[PDB]
Curated annotation (Swiss-Prot), chain A:
Name of the encoding gene: F2
Residue span(s) of domain Gla: 1-46
Domain (Kringle) ranges: 65-113
Source organism superkingdom: Eukaryota
Residues recorded with modification 4-carboxyglutamate: E6, E7, E14, E16, E19, E20, E25, E26, E29, E32
Residues listed as glycosylation sites in the UniProt record: N78, N100
SS bonds (residue pairs): C17-C22, C47-C60
Protein name listed in UniProt: Activation peptide fragment 1
Organism: Homo sapiens (Human)
UniProtKB/Swiss-Prot annotation, chains B, D:
The protein's name in its UniProt record: Hexon protein
Species assigned in the record: Human adenovirus C serotype 5
Self-association and partners: Homotrimer. Interacts with the capsid vertex protein; this interaction binds the peripentonal hexons to the neighboring penton base. Interacts with the hexon-linking protein; this interaction tethers the hexons surrounding the penton to those situated in the central plate of the facet. Interacts with the hexon-interlacing protein; this interaction lashes the hexons together. Interacts with host dyneins DYNC1LI1 and DYNC1I2; this interaction might be involved in intracellular microtubule-dependent transport of incoming viral capsid.
Induction: Expressed in the late phase of the viral replicative cycle.
Family: Belongs to the adenoviridae hexon protein family.
Gene it is expressed from: L3
Superkingdom in the source lineage: Viruses
Function comment: Major capsid protein that self-associates to form 240 hexon trimers, each in the shape of a hexagon, building most of the pseudo T=25 capsid. Assembled into trimeric units with the help of the chaperone shutoff protein. Transported by pre-protein VI to the nucleus where it associates with other structural proteins to form an empty capsid. Might be involved, through its interaction with host dyneins, in the intracellular microtubule-dependent transport of incoming viral capsid to the nucleus.
Additional detail: All late proteins expressed from the major late promoter are produced by alternative splicing and alternative polyadenylation of the same gene giving rise to non-overlapping ORFs. A leader sequence is present in the N-terminus of all these mRNAs and is recognized by the viral shutoff protein to provide expression although conventional translation via ribosome scanning from the cap has been shut off in the host cell.
Residues of the full protein shown: 402 to 451 of 952
Subcellular location: Virion; Host nucleus
Swiss-Prot record, chain C:
The name this protein goes by in its record: Hexon protein
Compartments where located: Virion; Host nucleus
Sequence similarity: Belongs to the adenoviridae hexon protein family.
Induction of expression: Expressed in the late phase of the viral replicative cycle.
Species whose genome carries this gene: Human adenovirus C serotype 5 (HAdV-5)
Length: 113, 50, 50, 50
């Protein structure tokens, strides 16, 4: 995001984004895919609480654990606090989730997790 | 016999390719029948120019 | 030439705006940069191509 | 005739402003009382100093 000789060097994700603080265009060369930047900004919206260290930010991005309020979660955990089986968010049964990509697309709601 | 030197003008060495620091951009055309507004036109132009 | 005056100039205006800006919708996509495309009788009178 | 060249010194150039790779920083003041103490002063010195 600085050092204009580094502007001769195409931005990387793990470089300018996590460790530095990549701009959206830096993040863009740093991911190419539009969906990659979508998930990137969803995380960074949820991961300002874990900006540093790089381990905090990476664990908040991956989502296989809980960071902050944990809406960034992306792991395999399908077991609640009291142990009742998780309902698949696509199936409206038992409880119909009005919460999906239409309402909050950032959380990237998974299969059953 | 030290008269000094004539250096009223600067001498600048330029990069080799003319320019180096540059961003990217995207084609744009006016949006008809709105008095303003714009829209993407990638029909015949690269979506990423220098 | 076009049938009258006959010495008119064929100069065109072209527009651009930031990629990620445009990125998504036309949420007010004010163009950022303007270029003027023309053509002229270029020629090298005293140099060759090495 | 060939005596070589008299070039016993370098002629480094420099950047137009004399410095390009600058780095931001922030004011630091010694904390009162306890020794080796430090803290931040933002009353007068601006937040960002290159
Ligand atoms: Ca950078
Ligand atoms: Ca950088
Ligand atoms: Ca840049
Ligand atoms: Ca870059
Ligand atoms: Ca870097
Ligand atoms: Ca590394
Ligand atoms: Ca660019």
């Amino acid at each position: 995001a600085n050092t204009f000789l580094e502007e001769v060097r195409k931005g990387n994700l793990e470089r300018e984004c996590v460790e530095e603080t990549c701009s959206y265009e830096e993040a863009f060369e740093a991911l190419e895919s539009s969906t990659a930047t979508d998930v990137f900004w969803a995380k960074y919206t949820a991961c300002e609480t874990a900006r540093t260290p790089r381990d905090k930010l990476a664990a908040c991005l991956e989502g296989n654990c809980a960071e902050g309020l944990g809406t960034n979660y992306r792991g395999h955990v399908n077991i609640t606090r009291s142990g009742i089986e998780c309902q698949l968010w696509r199936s409206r049964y038992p409880h119909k989730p009005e919460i999906n990509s239409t309402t909050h697309p950032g959380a990237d709601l998974q299969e059953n997790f | 016999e030290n008269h000094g030197t004539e250096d009223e003008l600067p001498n600048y060495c330029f990069p080799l390719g003319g320019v180096i620091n540059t961003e990217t951009l995207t084609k744009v055309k006016p949006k008809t029948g709105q008095e303003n507004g714009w829209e993407k036109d990638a029909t015949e132009f690269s979506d990423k120019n220098e | 030439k076009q049938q009258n005056g006959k010495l008119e100039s064929q100069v065109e205006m072209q527009f651009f705006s930031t990629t990620e800006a445009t990125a998504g919708n036309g949420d007010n996509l004010t163009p950022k940069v303007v270029l003027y495309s023309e053509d002229v009788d270029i020629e090298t009178p005293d140099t060759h191509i090495s």
